[PDB]
Write a protein that binds this ligand. Structure first.
Ligand SMILES: COc1cc(-c2cn(C)c(=O)c3cnccc23)cc(OC)c1CN(C)C
Length: 127
């Protein structure tokens, strides 16, 4: 019935770096997932008000979405690739916690996560 503030996508107090791995995450991983036919439920924060999900933010206390991850990558928010991978994992895990197995949203998250893992296993060695 009321949405929380969305996750931050900038913060001058957070340490940040540019790495070839973070470049890969934006140019390959995020690009591939963003354009996927099943991307759209994950491209913005869950609007629990508009979607009539009064329980969502009573269950999901660490929200994350690909729109936020996209902005964090574009804004050079991360210190390393593992911080970004964690955000993706939070997004997927939130979906499985809130929804039921076999739900359409869970099947779509599972398809995206399979592709995410295929791309992550080709993550370049840090130069
Ligand atoms: C970000 O946008 C959307 C999210 C969801 C959505 C996402 N996730 C992750 C969920 O767990 C979830 C759980 N229950 C119900 C809905 C969702 C659904 C959408 O449409 C049905 C849109 C589309 N909006 C333009 C309306």
């Amino acid at each position: 019935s009321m949405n929380p503030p969305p996750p931050e996508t900038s913060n001058p107090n957070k340490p940040k770096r540019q790495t070839n791995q973070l470049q890969y995450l934006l140019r390959v991983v995020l690009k591939t997932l963003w354009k996927h036919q099943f991307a759209w439920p994950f491209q913005q924060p869950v609007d629990a008000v508009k979607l009539n999900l009064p329980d969502y933010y009573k269950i999901i206390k660490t929200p994350m979405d690909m729109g936020t991850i996209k902005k964090r990558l574009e804004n050079n928010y991360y210190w390393n690739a593992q911080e970004c991978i964690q955000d993706f994992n939070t997004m997927f895990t939130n979906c499985y916690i809130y929804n039921k197995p076999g739900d359409d949203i869970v099947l779509m998250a599972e398809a995206l996560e399979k592709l995410f893992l295929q791309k992550i296993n080709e993550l370049p060695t840090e130069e």
